Structures are given as C-alpha cells and as structure tokens.
Amino acid sequence: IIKKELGLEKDDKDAIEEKFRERLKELVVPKHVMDVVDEELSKLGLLDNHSSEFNVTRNYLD
Amino acid sequence: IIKKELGLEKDDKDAIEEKFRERLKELVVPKHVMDVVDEELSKLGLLDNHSSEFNVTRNYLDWLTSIPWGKYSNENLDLARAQAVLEEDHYGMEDVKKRILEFIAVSQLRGSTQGKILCFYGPPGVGKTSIARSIARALNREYFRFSVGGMTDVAEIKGHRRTYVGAMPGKIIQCLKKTKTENPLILIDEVDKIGRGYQGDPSSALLELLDPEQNANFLDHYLDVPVDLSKVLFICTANVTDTIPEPLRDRMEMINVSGYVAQEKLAIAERYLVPQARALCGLDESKAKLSSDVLTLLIKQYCRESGVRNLQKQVEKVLRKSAYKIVSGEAESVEVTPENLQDFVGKPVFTVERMYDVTPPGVVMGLAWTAM
Amino acid sequence: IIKKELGLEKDDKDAIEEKFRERLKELVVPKHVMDVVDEELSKLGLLDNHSSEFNVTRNYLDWLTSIPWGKYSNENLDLARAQAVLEEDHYGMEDVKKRILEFIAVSQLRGSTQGKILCFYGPPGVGKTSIARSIARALNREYFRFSVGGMTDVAEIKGHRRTYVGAMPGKIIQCLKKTKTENPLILIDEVDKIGRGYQGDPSSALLELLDPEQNANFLDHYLDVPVDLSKVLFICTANVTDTIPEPL
Amino acid sequence: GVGKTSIARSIARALNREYFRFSVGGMTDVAEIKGHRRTYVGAMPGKIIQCLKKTKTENPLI
Ligand SMILES: Nc1ncnc2c1ncn2[C@@H]1O[C@H](COP(=O)(O)OP(=O)(O)O)[C@@H](O)[C@H]1O
Ligand SMILES: Nc1ncnc2c1ncn2[C@@H]1O[C@H](COP(=O)(O)OP(=O)(O)O)[C@@H](O)[C@H]1O
Ligand SMILES: Nc1ncnc2c1ncn2[C@@H]1O[C@H](COP(=O)(O)OP(=O)(O)O)[C@@H](O)[C@H]1O
C-alpha cells in the first residue's frame, strides 16, 4: 500500500521516462523525434536496468 | 496514515542524502550544480540500492560533491617570501622568477587570485617540473602534473560519457578532487609530443581548456556540468616550440629556461643535486663528500649536454657506490677526489672537447639549435 | 532456532562480512579503501544472495581483499650473505651484482626498503631472468614475471571495466594476489618487443607504472583504488635498447 | 510508392483472408517477432501474435 504514490512505483525506469517527458514538455518537439523517443523509451522498458545495451540506450536518450 | 506504516528505521537509506548535503554545506555551490544535485538526490531516493542506474547515480553524485565548489586555497601573496623560497629551491631561471613575482604582484593588486597559462620551453634536464613544484609550494597553491605526450584519447581531458559502467571523468576533475581547491597549479608535460591521430584531435580539447573565456565554463563528458578554470595556473613544457600547434602556441606566454654552462651546472650540482641525491641514498654530508673539482670533471668528461639529468645519474652512481663502501666496505667515510673518481664511476667518456681542433680545408664548424 | 543456538550461526551465512573483516584485520589497510569496503559490505548485505549482482559483488570483494595492503615482505639485508648467494648461483656479471649490492646498501642506510627500476639489456641466453630470480631469492622478496613482448592490448595490465561479462583485473593484480606481498619483484620480459598499435599503446600504462611518484597511486580499470608501488623492484629485460620507448 | 502493399491488400480481399503487414526494414532485434520470455517485467510477444490476434484468423495474409 505504501508503494502507492511513493517508493518504487516507477521501477527505476519510469523515473527516467517521466524525467525526460517533463524535460521535453516545454520544448516544441517535432513529431519524428517524438515517436523516436517513444520507441526508445518502449525499448528501455523492454530491457533490464542492469545491462550494457540499456545503458547505451539511456546515453542516446540523454 | 499510508506514510506512517512500518517505518523500520527507513531501511537505512536516505543517509547518503544527508551525508552529501553536509558535504556540500561547506562549499559555495552554484545554482546549476545545486539543482542538478537536488534532482539527482530525488531520483536516488525514488530508486532502490540494487539498481545499476542507482549505482551510476551514486558514483556521479560522489564525483560531483567531491569537487571543490568555491573552495580556494589560501594563496600566498607576500613577494619577499616567495622570492626567497624560489631562490632557495632553484638557481638562475631569472625570467621565470620575475614572471612569477610579477604574477603575484598583479594578483595581489587585482584582489582575488587568478591563473593564466605560461609555457616553459627548454631542453630536458633543466628544471621545468621542479620549478613548477617550487612555484606551487611557494605560492601555496596545490600541485598536479599531467602527461599529454603522445596522447590520442581526448577522454583523458574530457572524460567519458558517465554512462558506460566504470566510466571515469576527465583527469582535470580528478585533479580538482584530489587537490580539494579550484586554484591548483596544473602542469601539462610534453605538449609538443601530441600525435592527435585517429579518433583523437585532443588539441581542440586543450584549446577549450586553456582559452581564458571558454575555460571558465569547461565541462567534461562524464560530468556534463561546467566548471570554472579562470584561476587555475596551467604550465606547459616542451623542448621545441615548432611542433606545438599554432592555435595553442599563440594562446600562452612562452618562457625560455635554457642551458647551464659549466660554472652554472657546477653551482647547481654543488648546492642542489648532491644534497638531494645524498638524502635519497640515506647519507649525510660528513660520510659522503665531493670536491668541486670532481664535479667539474664529471661535467666536462662524463656529461655533454645543456641538460643536467646525466650529471644527476653520475652523482647518484658515485653516491650509491659510496653507500656500498660505507655499509659493508672498510671506509666509514668517503672523500671523493679525481684520483679516486676512476673507481666510483669509471674512466672518462668524453675525452675530446670536440671532433677536432684543426678544421682541415673544406670543413667548418657551425652551431645548431637542436631539440635537445 | 536450535541451529542458531548451536550450528552454523554466523558462519558463511551473511557472515562473509566478518570473514573478510578478519582477513583484512592483519593488513595495514588504507582509509579510502576502508570506506569503499564498508560501502561494498553494506551493498552485499542489502543484496539478496541469489542475485547474480550479489555474486559479482562477492567476487569483486574477494579480489580486493586478496590484495595485500601494507604487507611488506621481510627483506634480507646482510650484504655478505647476498653477495655470496649471487656469486654462488651465477658466474661473472660483476656490474649487475655491484648494482644490487649498492641497492642493498642504500636500502639498509635508508632504513625502510625502497624499490626502483632498472633494465638488464643483453644477448638472449645470458642469465638476465636467472639473475633476476637469484636477486629475488637473496633479497627474499617474492618473484613474478611478465612477458610484455608482442603485446598490444593494455587490458592484461589494467584489466577491464568490471562491467563487461566476465571482466577481469590486470595481470599485475593476479601477481599481487599470488605473491601475498606489496613489494614483490616484477620482471618485464621483451620490453623492446611492444607493438603499441591501434587501441594499444601499453607503453602509457608502463610509464604510469614505473613513474617514481605516480606509481605510488597506480590503479587499473577493474579495481579503481590506488596501490603503492614505491617499494616494488622492477626488472626489465630486452635484447636491444634502441627500440625501447625513450620516455620509458 | 508502387502499390505493392496495395497489391497485397487486393490479393487478401480477393482471397477472403484477413490482411496484415509487417515491417522488417532495418530491424536487428528478432524479439519483434520472438517477443520475450515473459519472465522479465514488461516483456511483450512478437508482431505475428499481434497479427493473429487482430485478424481473428489462423489463415491471414501476412
Ligand atoms: N637550476 C636548477 N636547480 C636545481 N635543480 C635543477 C636545476 N636545473 C635542473 N635541475 C634538476 O634537474 C632535474 C630535471 O627534472 P625534469 O623533470 O627533467 O625537468 P626538465 O624536464 O625541465 O629538466 C630536476 O630533478 C632538478 O633537480
Ligand atoms: N653466468 C651464468 N651462470 C650460470 N648460468 C648461466 C649464466 N649465463 C647463462 N646461464 C644459463 O643459461 C640459461 C639462460 O636462460 P635465461 O637466463 O632465462 O635467458 P635470458 O638471460 O635471455 O633471460 C639459464 O638457465 C642459465 O642457467
Ligand atoms: N497500378 C496501380 N494502380 C492504381 N493505383 C496504384 C497503382 N500502383 C500504386 N498505386 C497507388 O499507390 C498507393 C500505395 O502505394 P504503396 O503501397 O505505399 O507503394 P509501395 O508498395 O512502393 O510501398 C495506393 O494508394 C495506390 O492508389
């Protein structure tokens, strides 16, 4: 119950998701890069949080 | 009520938050790094201990907090004391001493302390690194050297991306962490030896590092946040001023520390080399003793170059053999003379001051300004 | 509960903390690596045993603790004894023996021991490796050899980042683990045979290793902690001197 | 821009089997058809399963 609205409800990756979404929210972002970022975030959520490819994907996303 | 449920000492986490906060409390912290730290700590709290991203975040945040932010060493500004220290540590090099005294004077008149680039170009075995250390200790700013010779990986200056696990920041951030101040005495060695080969071109990074207006916002790839390098006192050393890049050559004041004639080298050896190597060999003045004539013979027959390092090798060899002759040898003390010298170092090498002294027809002597 | 009262209680079941504590208790460990080890122990306690990351953490901690820290192997100092030993296991080679006696004398006069770098260059099959072994035997410091010839990658000297699957430390780390000493006698063989090609240039690592002042804080990719190397005595063997790098 | 997709659509309509299209251009990760073991959080099946589910048949025009 505590995890609700606190704790690890983001799972160490949705934090990255929301952080980048708010970072790009103010920006007038083109649609192409928008869908590219969506696909990259989907892949990141499709990968673990302890692999080299996950870290490289995070690097590219940053 | 949701919050107040099974506190259990908060699982021992969030103590790192307070530790970093107190670590930063003493520093004068810019707004950019402060907000980055706040957001990073929020993310760290949101995360768990096991996650790899959490470990990378902790490493990056420890690097960031270990930086000296607004922390400046208590720089020495007295001119007489600095002059006495420099004269007591090295001989000659009057131009460098005058330049450093003038820098001290302008910094004192200028209020806050500043740092500017100035390259010491001259032959090897002349005392450029040693005078850099002397300046660091006399002026009270910390010291750190950096070998750029034959370097091609710009990551040594600009670090890594901080993403690849095990990535390390630029060596300058390492120096800032170790020295603990933003006004060190950084020294770059073998500037002229850069190869800037494939995937390199570190000369661009050096330009960004030394440019007095760009360097103030220098950032490495690992720690993307910028840092202020308007007070760092860089030093560059190169035996030749031609191979050094023009954009980097014209960005600093080139000071010449060149050559040591027989009398000058003899004075240096008598007052600075012999005691240093003697202390290195765990000896005392009484036990091991050399005559000025012996030093002159070493200079004029066992060492032929503007530098001094070969004379250092010879004096170290004689002192080592004296130490052997003292520990186990019959002689409790040594009085080195040319007559004895033959056994301490061997027969002379340079028996001729020149190729010849007649200059037959069709051949003439000339002077060359070689790299060494 | 009975097992806790009588059994394995505090033995290899989360007691690896205490095992490594006692293992390092003998060593005169630094303080930076002390806080590092405390942090790693906290992680291991907070890490579940089954997880692969827990096992990798234990592997890294074993690698770190296995290194000596302040372990100065006792050094022979009787000059006559070492002289007799050298004259017993090798003929001639007067210059090398004289240099070794000079080193012994300066170490004795300094009190504490110290380690410098010196290269034996000459034709193959002359006794350079054998007299290095004899010097290790007489001086009593442990002996290890390293063939750097025909070698390009620096990984075998500075290991890996520890993140690559099965990343391993440098060969010097293996030597330190095997010797159980902080001042062993490393022997670099075929120094003049380095290739220093693409992605290589191990001469940079060699210079960082043999630097009289930077050596005191050498560290590799796998282990990111400095190690003191001002007392280790290196020996370099090369059939010729021209092809060896000038900075080295 | 030659209508090959339109040719496939017309073939499906004339054959009465459901239509679907798959993009294999530049793909490197076979997981888009092989999905993932479902043991990892967020794992998703391949695209052929999506085609079968959406088409509501085992005899579509892939
Ligand atoms: N004027 C001098 N006074 C004292 N020592 C000197 C002088 N010139 C040279 N040396 C000695 O020569 C050595 C040169 O050090 P090094 O790192 O080679 O600097 P550089 O490359 O400028 O010669 C120093 O250890 C220093 O003791
Ligand atoms: N002066 C000597 N005294 C005793 N043995 C020698 C001497 N010179 C050479 N040898 C022998 O020759 C062999 C040469 O092998 P090694 O010394 O490893 O070659 P290198 O000297 O090229 O490293 C050794 O096993 C050694 O026993
Ligand atoms: N032979 C054709 N007759 C009529 N329309 C055609 C023909 N070829 C292509 N088209 C037009 O092309 C469009 C679809 O093109 P598309 O399938 O995207 O090209 P491609 O197959 O190269 O990807 C349709 O709207 C269709 O009207």
Q: Angle at the Cα of B277 (from B272 to B279), degrees rounded to 5?
A: 100
Cβ neighbours of residue C136 closer than 8 Å, sequence gap 6 or more: C142, C143, C185
Looking at the DSSP bridge assignments, the partners of residue C199 are none
Dihedral of the CA atoms B87, B90, B96, B98 (nearest 10)?
10
Residue B73 phi, psi (nearest 5): -65, 150
Residue type, C43: K
C123 CA distance to ligand 2 centroid (A)? 11
- Determine the residue of chain B that is closest to A16 in CA distance: B43
> Within a 10 A sphere around the Cβ of B359, how many other Cβ atoms?
11
D58 CA distance to ligand 3 centroid (A)? 27
Look-up of token digits 């100065």: C72
Centroid of chain to Cα C124 = 26
Whether B48 contacts chain A with CB within 8 A: yes
Residue B146 phi, psi (nearest 5): -155, 120
Nearest Cα neighbor of B221 from B175, B174, B154 is B154
Nearest Cα neighbor of C149 from C194, C119, C187, C203 is C194
Alpha-carbon gap, residue C117 to C248, rounded angstroms: 10
Alpha-carbon gap, residue B150 to C247, rounded angstroms: 10
Give helix B171-179 / helix B52-66 axis angle, nearest 10°: 60
Q: Please, how many CA atoms are within 13 Å of residue B235, restricted to the half-sphere of its CB?
A: 28
Cβ–Cβ under 8 Å, residues B289 and B328: no
Alpha-carbon gap, residue B97 to B112, rounded angstroms: 21
Whether C109 contacts chain B with CB within 8 A: yes
Taking CA atoms only, the protein residue closest to ligand 3 atom 13 is D3
Cβ–Cβ under 8 Å, residues B235 and B118: yes
Cβ–Cβ under 8 Å, residues B125 and B312: yes
What is the DSSP annotation of chain C?
-HHHHSSSTTSSSS-HHHHHHHHHHSS---SHHHHHHHHHHHHHHHS-SSSHHHHHHHHHHHHHHHS-SS--------HHHHHHHHHHH--S-HHHHHHHHHHHHHHHHHSS----EEEEE--SSSSHHHHHHHHHHHH---EEEEE-TT---SHHHH---S-STT----HHHHHHHHHT-SS-EEEEE-GGG----TT--THHHHHHHH-TTGGGGB--SS--S-B--SS--EEEEES-SSSS-S--
Residue B185 in 3-state DSSP?
Answer: strand
Over C112-177, what HEC string results?
Answer: CCCCCEEEEECCCCCCHHHHHHHHHHHHCCCEEEEECCCCCCCHHHHCCCCCCCCCCCCHHHHHHH
Which tokens sit at C18? 């205490």
Nearest bound ligand to the CA of residue C126: 2
Whether C219 contacts chain B with CB within 8 A: no
Burial of B372 (0-12, 13-18, 19+ CB in 10 A): exposed
Nearest Cα neighbor of A18 from A6, A27, A10, A7 is A10
| b/e code B175-190 from CB counts within 10 Å (16+ = b) | bbbebebbbbbbbbbb
- Determine the residue of chain C that is closest to A55 in CA distance: C163
Q: Kindly report each contact of residues C95-98 with a partner whose C-beta sits within 8 Å and lies 24 or more positions away, as own/partner.
A: C96/C120, C96/C131, C98/B321, C98/B324
Which tokens sit at C125? 């099959």
Q: Which of C51, C108, C161 sits opposite B327 (nearest CB)?
A: C108
Cβ–Cβ under 8 Å, residues B46 and B5: no
**Which run of H or E residues covers position B166?**
none
Which tokens sit at B53? 């991203």
Which residues of A fall within a CB distance of 8 Å from C57?
Answer: none
Cβ neighbours of residue A13 closer than 8 Å, sequence gap 6 or more: A44, A45, A49, B53
